[PDB]
Amino acid sequence: SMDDHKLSLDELHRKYGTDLSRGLTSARAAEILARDGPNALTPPPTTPEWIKFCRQLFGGFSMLLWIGAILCFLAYSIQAATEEEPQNDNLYLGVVLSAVVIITGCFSYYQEAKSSKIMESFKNMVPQQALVIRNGEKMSINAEEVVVGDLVEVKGGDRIPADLRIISANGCKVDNSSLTGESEPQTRSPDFTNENPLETRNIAFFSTNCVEGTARGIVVYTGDRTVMGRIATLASGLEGGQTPIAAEIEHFIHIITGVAVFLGVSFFILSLILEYTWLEAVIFLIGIIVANVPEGLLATVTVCLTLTAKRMARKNCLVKNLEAVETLGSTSTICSDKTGTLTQNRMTVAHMWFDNQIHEADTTENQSGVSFDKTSATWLALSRIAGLCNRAVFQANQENLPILKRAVAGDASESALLKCIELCCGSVKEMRERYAKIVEIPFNSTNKYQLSIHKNPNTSEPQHLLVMKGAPERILDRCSSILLHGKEQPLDEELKDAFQNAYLELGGLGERVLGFCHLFLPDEQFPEGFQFDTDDVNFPIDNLCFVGLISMIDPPRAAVPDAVGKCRSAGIKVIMVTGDHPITAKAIAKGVGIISEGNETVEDIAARLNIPVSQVNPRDAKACVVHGSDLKDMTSEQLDDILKYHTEIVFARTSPQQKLIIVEGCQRQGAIVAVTGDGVNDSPALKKADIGVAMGIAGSDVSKQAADMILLDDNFASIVTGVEEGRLIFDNLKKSIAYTLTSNIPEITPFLIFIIANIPLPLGTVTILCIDLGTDMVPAISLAYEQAESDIMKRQPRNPKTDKLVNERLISMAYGQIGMIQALGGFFTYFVILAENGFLPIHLLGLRVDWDDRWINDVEDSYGQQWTYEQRKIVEFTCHTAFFVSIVVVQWADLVICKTRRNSVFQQGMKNKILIFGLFEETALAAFLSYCPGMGVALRMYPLKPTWWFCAFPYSLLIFVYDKVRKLIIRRRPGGWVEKETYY
């Protein structure tokens, strides 16, 4: 679209009004600069941190607690204005509720996406200076003033300032890893080659650099109008959406808020029916609101996520967005880049054909694989040729590095041969010391081979050797003999056919193959003193002795095949999206396990059946390779057909925005897509993906700015660890949420029984705040340390539509059975405290009016004694303390039964030390609140008689026994009615 390589030299120059050699006039340049704008990328506006905190302050439970604080202030105002002797109870309650909202907002703010600096990273890719021709003179100017249609000169590693239409080039090559992710240099020529501007040779793109040569070009786009500028704008404008854990959190927030609103409004209007005062009604509503809302639930979730993130931070896996922890566990599809992500981004020797045999060398970066045999004399000769006909040389001051991981000055092929020789045998410095190079002829465009004549290995004066490397099937056209185990024999036709089979077989693995041979002087007819520097000498290079073939490829990382296998076992569809050529993409897919053995593509089936690809039924092939050109004009519906029916998909030659198209197509089927990449062309895909993972060492700055997680050590098994930890934290979050929600009922029910049966209040609001914000925090957090009940890597990825973090079964279980047992235990303790002090349970019915009356100071108990207001209020507050302690006692068994969901509690053992400390700390905090001096004035907590601690013991035992029996029924009948209704 909008191509400028079609126009001729004059047609391009007349469109822009630019002289071919004189350049652009300064006045016209200034006019165009004022007309179009500066050569710069505009950062996208960012929401200030002030707003984001405020946004977090108004979500779900926060609104209910805001209503509670408002009602507390209103109650204080009413109390003061009416009875003129105020107590600082409702005011302090409102202040505490507001502080709780602020702290919960802080916790939510920590657990939030921290935005990205992608556009800043692109601005690090624009050059600071540009060489521009104006008035027929070279000048170095600030790149921001570079306008369209002026002569720009690039050379010698300089980054291209803007998209150029190259009109002159002297051996120019550019690195297009920003557009294709592939670092092999691309030649730039003035002539038109290909229709597509990305693959054509005369266009030079912004954010790329000229590795070698010089080029004079014409600017065709500037600033945001460049190809990479539009990609940067797209990446900045994109958002990752709502994470799945955020959706689950919003779901159960909606459920709990709806229940709270229903109960609050129903019982508030009921209290107005019963002719309660406005102050009494608002106090009751505050109690209901505090009882229904779990104050410490969201902070607990944030702490669990943080702990799991720290668990992965130890394994060299850095989690930037806290919500990204569970997204990997929920992932069902992984779109993977090839180079740098799955492969090692380094050209390495893979196979050798010699001894009429194929030997596979070790390609792993850590060298954990086995090596081949070094015992062959022709192998010694081949290693000598490969390491001695090599122009590449190691860069200095890095001898303290592994050979494969050290910088080399030379081509990728030359460096691959250099490193292979270094690992295999000796060192190239000493090889050149022993064999002094006396002449060489480098690679030629018309010869396609390189030779070097140097001193013999036999040390004899007359003998020298010529070593030659070149194309495989052409180099033996000059050869006539071969070395076999150190013995030379003439070239046999069977040997030629075997060579052809080996060349096609190594080439069939997507590897560049090269042939190496040498020749010795026949006799003394050519003396050593003869000068070989004579150009076009009449000494043809023929009748050589073919030595061997060496193949090269960018090999997969060591752990990538096993990681892909584990992910496929976990039910994850792993798609391969690459900007490289289709043949290499298919070869790497077969190598790492994207395309399994025994599965064929439509083209492969056609080749097998010797029929055109049209006759092959596309439904037969379960694997497909889709070229970028086909993906371009392909409509969305056709893309959805490819994803649905093919199980092994490889997209090849994909532009950066086509990766985005593929990611959106995958997400269109309701899938959680994780993208792994390490280049700047993956940044839109990393932004759009549900979770973006970028490599640490090999990753570019843009990729790690656009990603949610970074593999710091570039270990691809960290993906397996991440999905396992995501599934584990999902299960443990279910457990923790169930435990937190269970204790709500012992706080809701006292208010309802209060308003219904008009008994004295069994539980206070401050006591409720002491439960959730206090004794319930550490035990709830401790569930995050639970181990997996089984192998969680065998189950399929969870369905976001069907599987909820909080479903009806969890709500049903916690609110209806365990919560009601806990409420019964608390009410029994309440009745015991009141009965043993004089107020029998029958006498409590209808006593609310007199008990709460500050002026009636002769309330008669069941024994004829008369109590004042404060005397009976002390008993009521003791009942509140005992109710709190009873909730703690039943929460003991609640924690024990929430430790597991299917297996026996003592089956797995007490591996979780944090849970035991949680039990002990909960009990210790309860005792400290009860018995510390001054707690009768602060929280109205009062000392409990020792026998009163055991009132709730029978109900805790009932909870434990009921859960154990239910679990036993679950395992005996997995498809039973109990499992369909209780299991969550």
Partner: protein, 268 residues
């Protein structure tokens, strides 16, 4: 803009009501009915076992009620403030009705069964009969039902009863008395009629509702007089126990422990 909920209720296929079928609804309601029935049975059994350990005569603990409070009768409508109009019988009718309803056990007619006890001595009863001492209504002279039909009302001199809180097995030491004084500088005269407060020891100790049948707590009646022409309204008067060390009356947390403050206003 789509009603996904409408199909969710009353699904024609499978007959699922609110996401659950008729059979499954029956099963889940039956399960919850049986579960809550078992829970209620366990709670009832545990309550009955707790009640079996209790004593019907005397509470297990008395540490939360060590000293008696002081209360006035009848209870005013709002904030323990007596308001009435001398010319309007209906204003002070409720006080009259409450006073006659309360003082009915104290008259000579009903307490003929009760026994006269020697004065000034604590009456300890080890025996199981637990007979009660009688309180003559003549002790509240000019504030009792016999002298006048209206308990001081319509004369500008209302009568109010001050009574000590009942506590089981409480033995006051010393000579307990109740003294009432006006707080304002106008000091309208207050006259506790049975001499001083003079709570007699012969009524103590209280032995409970079950055991000590027919107990009549000692009563102290006050009369705050007002002038015929001068209403003398908004008078605050405070009564307290100052004759006994056992009965504490200086507490700060509880303003009704051993004392009581009440306000009187009169019209015309």
């Amino acid at each position: 803009s789509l009603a996904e909920w409408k199909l969710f209720i009353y699904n024609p296929t499978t007959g699922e009501f609110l996401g659950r079928t008729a059979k499954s609804w029956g099963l889940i309601l039956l399960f919850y009915l049986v579960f809550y029935g078992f829970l209620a049975a366990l709670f009832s059994f545990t309550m009955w076992v707790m009640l079996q350990t209790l004593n019907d005569e005397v509470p297990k603990y008395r540490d939360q009620i060590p000293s008696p409070g002081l209360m006035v009768f009848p209870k005013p409508v709002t904030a323990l403030e007596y308001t009435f109009s001398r010319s309007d019988p209906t204003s002070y009718a409720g006080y009259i009705e409450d006073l006659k309803k309360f003082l009915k056990p104290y008259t000579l007619e009903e307490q003929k069964n009760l026994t006269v006890c020697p004065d000034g001595a604590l009456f300890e009863q080890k025996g199981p009969v637990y007979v009660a001492c009688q309180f003559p209504i003549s002790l509240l002279q000019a504030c009792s039902g016999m002298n006048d039909p209206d308990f001081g009302y319509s004369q500008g001199n209302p009568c109010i009863l001050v009574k000590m809180n009942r506590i089981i097995g409480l033995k006051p030491e010393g000579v307990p008395r109740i003294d009432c004084v006006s707080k304002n500088e106008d000091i309208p005269n207050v006259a506790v009629y049975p001499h001083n407060g003079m709570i007699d020891l012969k009524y103590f100790p209280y032995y409970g509702k079950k055991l000590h049948v027919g107990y009549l707590q000692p009563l102290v009646a006050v009369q705050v007089s007002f002038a015929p022409n001068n209403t003398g309204k908004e008078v605050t008067v405070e009564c307290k126990i100052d004759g006994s060390a056992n009965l504490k009356s200086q507490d700060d947390r509880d303003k009704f422990l051993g004392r009581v403050m009440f306000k009187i206003t009169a019209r015309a």
